[PDB]
Amino acid sequence: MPVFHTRTIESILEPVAQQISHLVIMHEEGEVDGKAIPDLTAPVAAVQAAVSNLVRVGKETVQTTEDQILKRDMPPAFIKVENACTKLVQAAQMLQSDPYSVPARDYLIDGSRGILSGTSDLLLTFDEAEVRKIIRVCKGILEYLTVAEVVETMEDLVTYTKNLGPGMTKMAKMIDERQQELTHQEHRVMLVNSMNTVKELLPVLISAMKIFVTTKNSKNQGIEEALKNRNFTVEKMSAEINEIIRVLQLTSWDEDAWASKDTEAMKRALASIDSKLNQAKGWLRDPSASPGDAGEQAIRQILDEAGKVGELCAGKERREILGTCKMLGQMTDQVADLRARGQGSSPVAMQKAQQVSQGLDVLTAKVENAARKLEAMTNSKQSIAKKIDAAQNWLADPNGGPEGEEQIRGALAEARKIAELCDDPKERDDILRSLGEISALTSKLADLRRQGKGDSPEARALAKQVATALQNLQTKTNRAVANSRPAKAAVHLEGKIEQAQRWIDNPTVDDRGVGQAAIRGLVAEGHRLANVMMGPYRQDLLAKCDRVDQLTAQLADLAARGEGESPQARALASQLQDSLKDLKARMQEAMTQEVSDVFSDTTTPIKLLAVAATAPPDAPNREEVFDERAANFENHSGKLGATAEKAAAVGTANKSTVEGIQASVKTARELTPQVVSAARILLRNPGNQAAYEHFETMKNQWIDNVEKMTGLVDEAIDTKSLLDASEEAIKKDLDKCKVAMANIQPQMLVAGATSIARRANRILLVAKREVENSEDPKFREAVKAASDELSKTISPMVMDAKAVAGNISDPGLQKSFLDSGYRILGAVAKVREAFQPQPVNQPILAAAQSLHREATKWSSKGNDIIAAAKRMALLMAEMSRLVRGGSGTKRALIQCAKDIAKASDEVTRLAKEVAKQCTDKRIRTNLLQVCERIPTISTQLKILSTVKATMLGRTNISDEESEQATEMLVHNAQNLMQSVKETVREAEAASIKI
């Protein structure tokens, strides 16, 4: 396959394929029009010269570079290119004899593919080696990690504190080489953002090591908690290093990410169901304890996370978790109806207090059914990706060995077993296709039964066809999960609109199940948004949530009775589509009300934990205060993480901002135990001088983590939305200042004056971060200036608070406080005041009209990015028939190779054109990250469409590899035009910002 693993490989193949394109448009009169050609016999030797240079180094790389497996695979590679090139000249030599010789036109069309596959192989095959030594570098590091528990003593500390140096500095220089070598934002970003984690936390690993000798100064057998905290980061060192091992091994377009990035969600979920197990079910079992806000909230946290389990599995099980959870919702409100009146809850729910419980416990077992199957479904994809390589191993160099046949037939016994474990009852057409191919693969395995004496002359034709048989397996085993795993929720919210706007009125991806998960996805968050409010404000959102819930199944049926053209089917679709638009501004405005109420006192228990970190047992209650401060820490943090990830998945952010949140909240998910772990050991070995800075380390980790996140959640939501949900929020809190002055409450003003300064400091912090991202000097000055007005008045509120706490029954004095309070909030309001101003492949024809709905968001004709998007998706419509068919006109397919890249290099330009006029860093940076994959994938379509041109109309065309050709055609145009959707949107989204 014509890979694009390296910047160099693109920089050569497009020079390779530029004239093989021009070679085979001569083949258009060569066999389609069937007539004589002009003498392009010199471009023959030119592209020979364009490959012989890498051949003449590739020939000697077999011998000069002393690696073993390069000697194995290269003589398959370039000799095929040599077998191609020798046929090219003789095609022209037979065309020197004859103006148009029927074999000679077929000899040249024979070689025109084998170069392009071969050159893409040759440029890959030793770039495969360039990655390979970096593995053993990392394997050197990963096993020098393994040294660092064999090493636990100080006499090897400063040695290996130095020995990391020529490893770790030698790590990053190879990576920062390779960081320039890839050409995907999806790859370049996830490489280095795992590479900084190992270099940042190796001093933290050293910080564990430097404090372990301090514990080793204390007596043994109570000190391995540090080595377990070492093992904490070392398993993270096991984690983030292993990630970038296999990132560089990917060497193509990304496919197995989503099957892998859903493994994390269930173990996020199933732990969270285990963690929210006890406190949820108690309110279910206590009628007369809480009226529906404390453990009732954790009840719905169980259900809306198990609802996120059911966003993964397939079939009718996509309904049976939805059907179990939604019917559990009303019956809790049937329980909530009882204690709203009171008499029904304790005596009368002798039956009712168990039908709710049985719809949780078997629901726990029902989502447990989706647990181990979906681990094992993504699993053994990699095993059958590995047992083919074990089959690829010996079948390259057989040497006529009949006991190498015996181990290559024993290795296929495991390669047998996987597809029966990969069997599903759904794709019965493909299952008999799969299971029928397996015994056929044992029959070409049974070719080796006749070789009592092994035959490489049999094996050279055996490996000629078992290699095409294994890629007939792997391109079908990955389908055996792809048509069995439903289409995922686009994690940013505007995708879940788009994954469900067009979904409801079309049978196409009704076979796929995009919106059926996505609508189940989208109101599993407004369902969780309504979880955090009290009694009466739980229902007003749930009434909009239950609106879609009863708009759910009554559009699951109208695919039978008519379609979207049917009148009340369209009306129920129109009732559903109108239901979601007023489920926007009561979802994200529901969100931003929460974030200005969770992140207020953003770190106040931690300075209280710092009080708990310093107080000896000479100070009173060094344990139970230290418990409840940590209990205040651990449970406010549960709000802190969960408020962020909701504001992640609802807030309009970059993908890099969303995963930037998603990793940082994951960083919060274990550092919050580490803050507990840091405050622990300082109180285990009491009052160490060397443990305070380690506590101060993880604190100023977590403070830097949270004051990243505090700033980074502010990257997600609107700053119009934060202030308005803060100015009104501080307004009642200055009205809370009015209630505690009417009675004699000094400390409630002392708790309140902080509560201003908990937030009024942060309002200044958001204003400065707005300025440094702003560049209009008239429209960044007041955000600096009024923040400094806020700076002018934050400190006198602390001072007169001490003046009025000493005398609470002093009108005038407490009046002067609230009058000093009166000066605050109008200036706080100023912050948002500045913010006021036929043989057709289907995924071709779908992706054309898919792009058109996105560019029709803007409704004018001025800037030609919509004319760029016009020519974009329209000029794939002609090649809809030309993939899978249209055997003659190969020339239009390459005419489509160029014009699409010509469009997706034009909109490359205009994306970064207005980015040069983009008046915000964060808007330009997010525009820059996506726009570098506009030209990269464009030129790849110059290759791949030209590759299928040789795969077109020969009539010796294998419809496995023509399918492999047309898969890479259509998989491109998805990833092509989905990036173009992000382009023509965010160009307009940056257009108003000027």
Numbering used by the authors: 1 to 837, 960 to 1116
Give the published text:
To further our understanding of metavinculin activation and function, we determined the 4.17 Å cryogenic electron microscopy structure of metavinculin in its native state. The initial processing of a single ab initio three-dimensional reconstruction, including all particles accounting for best two-dimensional classes, and subsequent homogeneous refinement yielded a 4.17 Å resolution structure that overall resembled our earlier crystal structures confirming overall the auto-inhibited conformation of metavinculin. The local resolution estimate suggested that the central core is well ordered to 4.2 to 4.5 Å and contributes toward the overall resolution of the metavinculin structure. The peripheral α-helices are in the 5 to 6 Å resolution range, while a few of the surface regions exhibit resolution of less than 8 Å. While this interface is restricting the remaining domains roughly in their places, our cryogenic electron microscopy structure shows that they are surprisingly mobile. In our cryogenic electron microscopy structure, we did not observe a definitive density for the C-terminus (residues 1120 to 1134). This suggests that this region is flexible and in various conformations. The coiled coil (residues 949–960) preceding the α-helix H1’ could not be built in our cryogenic electron microscopy structures with residue 840 through 960 missing. To better resolve and visualize the molecular motions of metavinculin in detail, three-dimensional variability analyses were carried out with the default option of three modes on the entire stack of 1,303,504 particles that was subjected to homogeneous refinement. Out of the three modes computed by three-dimensional variability analyses, one mode provided a glimpse of discrete conformational states presented by metavinculin in solution.
Vinculin and its larger and muscle-specific spliced isoform called metavinculin play pivotal roles in cell adhesion by regulating cellular morphology, cellular motility, and by the transducing force between neighboring cells as well as between cells and the extracellular matrix At cell–cell and cell–matrix junctions, (meta)vinculin functions as a scaffold where it connects transmembrane cell surface receptors to the filamentous actin cytoskeleton. Vinculin and metavinculin have seven four-helix bundle domains that are connected via a about 40 residue (in vinculin) or about 100 residue (in metavinculin) flexible proline-rich linker to their respective and distinct five-helix bundle tail domains, which is called Vt in vinculin, for vinculin tail, or MVt in metavinculin, for metavinculin tail. Metavinculin has 68 amino acids inserted into the vinculin polypeptide chain between vinculin residues 915 and 916. Vinculin and metavinculin are held in their closed auto-inhibited conformers by an extensive nanomolar affinity interface between their N-terminal four-helix bundle Vh1 subdomains and their respective Vt or MVt tail domains.
